[PDB]
Amino acid sequence: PLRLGGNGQWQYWPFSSSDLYNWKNNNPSFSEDPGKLTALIESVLTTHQPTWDDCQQLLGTLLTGEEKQRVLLEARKAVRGNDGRPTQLPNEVDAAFPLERPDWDYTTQRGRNHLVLYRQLLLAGLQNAGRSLEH
């Protein structure tokens, strides 16, 4: 999580393990009921402003390896180019939705801007994977 500090600086705080444990174990699996975990994750992305690593941890905890892989792959399918339309250009896809830890600096606006886009894409990916599972 990212939090605006009392000194005007953005601070990184890791998820608490009790929160992670509870989110997973108080909830049905993603495959069994995609809507419940999707809603949970959407709220977490909003309220906790997680970093790229937080998102990996959140997905890793709540999803199985197969679920998580589908979700990230769907997220990358959601990347758009300048024309406001889909792109499959590796450099554009990787730039918006990196699968490897990026160099994004949470203390900077550029870095928080990348994070906002990444979380929007992740949510789309989650929604879209959920729908496939639902039909």
Numbering used by the authors: 1 to 135
What sentences appear in the manuscript?
Mammalian cells show different susceptibilities to retrovirus infection. N-terminal β-hairpin and a core bundle of six α-helices. at positions 82, 92–94, 110, 114 and 117, can change the tropism of MLV.
tryptophan substitution at amino acid position 10 in CA. of the CA-NtD of this variant at 2.0Å resolution. RMSD of 0.6Å across equivalent Cα atoms. of the channel the aliphatic L10 side-chain forms the base. L10 in the base of the groove is shown in red. hairpin together with R112 and T107 from the α5–6 loop. residues 8 and 10 in the β-hairpin. forms part of the rhTRIM5α binding site. defined Fv1 binding pocket must be extended to include this region. observation that huTRIM5α restricted the L10W mutant virus.
